Write a protein that binds this ligand. Structure first.
Ligand code: DGL
Length: 264
């Protein structure tokens, strides 16, 4: 009846703000979340609906041990680690389903479609991730500068499928999306390769609409965000049924409009 839920800030899917200074409570659509503050956003609204529909209470906390999830020398960190090591009953956020993670935790059915996209300044001109500027990176006279934020499903995918390109990207690793966008707009990066759902949102919200996304096309695989649960969790089925209901009730579509819209 009571679940411990791990999450991670990644706007606009999870947004963290201080409590209302006047009341000292989380107001509006926000809910209390502690650190491993008030949380809101697309995924938090999903969590609120799951809790109401299925009928559980929860304790929400922000992950400080890494981010989404990476395995290093046999040990998982991030949201995936919290679930795998059974510190949390579930993790919800902008958490990407991939093969490696699916082996060790169960995922809900996907509730947001994602993958990998490439962001560049509208001025800049490359074809896409197929472009040899990316693929044969150290062939270009002034090298192309492209990076990702390391440790997530994007870097995992690139290292596994395009190890040459990955090796070239390492020096351009960015600490978070905000800095990457800054470097891209300053021309310190030529492209930023990252989660599609997030990148496409950032493109839509860009002050002045100067940042644009290119589809990765055939280069990378589509996937989705899923809620992570203990392998064999009894919670998977009721979570899935609820999510499926939300999808067909246009509740998810409504939340997309609410949280992920932009003018660009
Ligand atoms: N959703 C993030 C992907 C971030 C990225 O593009 O690396 C994850 O679960 O790892």
């Amino acid at each position: 009846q009571h679940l411990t839920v791990a999450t991670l800030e990644e706007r606009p899917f999870v947004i963290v703000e201080p409590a209302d200074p006047i009341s000292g409570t989380c107001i509006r659509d926000s809910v209390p979340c502690r650190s491993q503050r008030c949380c809101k956003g697309f995924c938090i609204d999903i969590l609120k609906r799951l809790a109401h529909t299925i009928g559980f209470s929860y304790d929400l906390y922000l992950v400080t041990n890494g981010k989404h999830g990476k395995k290093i020398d046999g040990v998982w960190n991030g949201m995936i680690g919290e679930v795998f090591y059974q510190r949390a009953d579930m993790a919800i956020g902008s958490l990407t389903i991939n093969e490696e993670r699916s082996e060790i935790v169960d995922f809900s059915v996907p509730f947001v479609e994602t993958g990998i996209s490439v962001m560049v300044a509208r001025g800049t001109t490359v074809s896409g991730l197929s472009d040899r500027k990316f693929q044969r990176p150290q062939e270009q006279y002034p090298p192309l500068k492209f990076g990702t934020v390391p440790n997530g499903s994007t870097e995992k995918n690139i290292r596994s499928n395009y190890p040459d390109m990955h090796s070239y990207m390492v020096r351009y690793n960015q600490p978070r999306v905000e800095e990457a966008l800054t470097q891209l707009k300053a021309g310190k990066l030529d492209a930023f390769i990252y989660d599609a759902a997030v990148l496409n949102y950032m493109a839509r919200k860009d002050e002045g609409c100067k940042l644009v996304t290119i589809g990765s096309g055939k280069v990378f695989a589509t996937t989705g965000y899923g809620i992570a649960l203990h392998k064999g969790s009894r919670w998977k089925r009721p979570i899935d049924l609820a999510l499926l209901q939300f999808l067909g009730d246009d509740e998810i579509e409504m939340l997309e409009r609410l949280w992920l819209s932009g003018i660009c």
